[PDB]
């Protein structure tokens, strides 16, 4: 029958409950987040260390010792998996690092594997394994060989 029209039951989140866990204000937005038994504005759920939006990729956060953390910060604080690609030593929390491609380095470790010079802004380089090689070492290799 074309005359048949459905009557659906709707169970909404009550407007009183929609207070953000990060700013304590009402959420009147259509799109928002649920996490750790709270509701949040998309810009109100941040990493306690770095302050990035927490579930943007992978839809998960990492909670330990009263800290909501992103994957990398969680592993920097608690995980054994935060070693540098050059010196093979653990990356301290609150430490700024340099990532070339998929490998991570200390800034003092961010130097050429051959001539040992510290890289400057705009320096061309090549990454072989976990070794970064400067352009003038690539040119000096190919000069002897052709």
């Amino acid at each position, epitope marked *: 029958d074309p005359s048949e029209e459905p009557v659906d039951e709707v169970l909404q989140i009550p407007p009183s409950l929609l207070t953000c866990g990060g700013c304590q204000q009402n959420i009147g937005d259509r799109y928002f987040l649920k996490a750790i038994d709270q509701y949040w504005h998309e*810009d109100c759920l*941040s*990493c306690d*260390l*770095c*302050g*990035c939006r927490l579930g*943007e990729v992978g839809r998960r956060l990492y909670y330990k010792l009263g800290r909501k953390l*992103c*994957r*990398r*910060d969680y592993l*920097r604080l608690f995980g054994q998996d935060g070693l540098c690609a050059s010196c093979d030593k653990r990356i301290r929390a*609150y*430490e*700024m*690092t*340099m*990532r*070339v491609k998929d490998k*991570v380095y200390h*800034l*003092e470790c*961010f*130097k050429c594997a051959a001539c040992q010079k*510290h*890289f*400057c*802004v*705009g*320096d061309r*380089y090549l990454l072989i394994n976990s070794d*970064i090689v400067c352009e003038q070492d690539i040119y000096e290799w190919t000069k002897i060989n052709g």
Partner: nanobody
Amino acid sequence: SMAEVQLLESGGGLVQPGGSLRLSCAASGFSFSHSPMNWVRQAPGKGLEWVSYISYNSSSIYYADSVKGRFTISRDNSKNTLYLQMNSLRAEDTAVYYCARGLTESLELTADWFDYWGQGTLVTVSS
């Protein structure tokens, strides 16, 4: 369809010890409002030295020990500008100061110069 990333550092110059400078960086070509920003300096011979970090909404802010209590980072997302207030300047602060775009997750820089780094502005504190 891809816009070119641009970071233009302003301010800086020559001043005496105890002097003060205000650095600015105008940004375009990426969503600045969703990007953690940095100031990173460099002298010749010496490697790159990170100075200060600021999260997209300014909720997280960090400084190098050498600059704590002297330098102040800030941003204005509506104007796409990053700032650095440099006070109580000393000879060790002499370097080229770059505005560096950070990776979105967990205090990281990247060596993609074209997409994440400016051309820098020179700061010099006399002998």
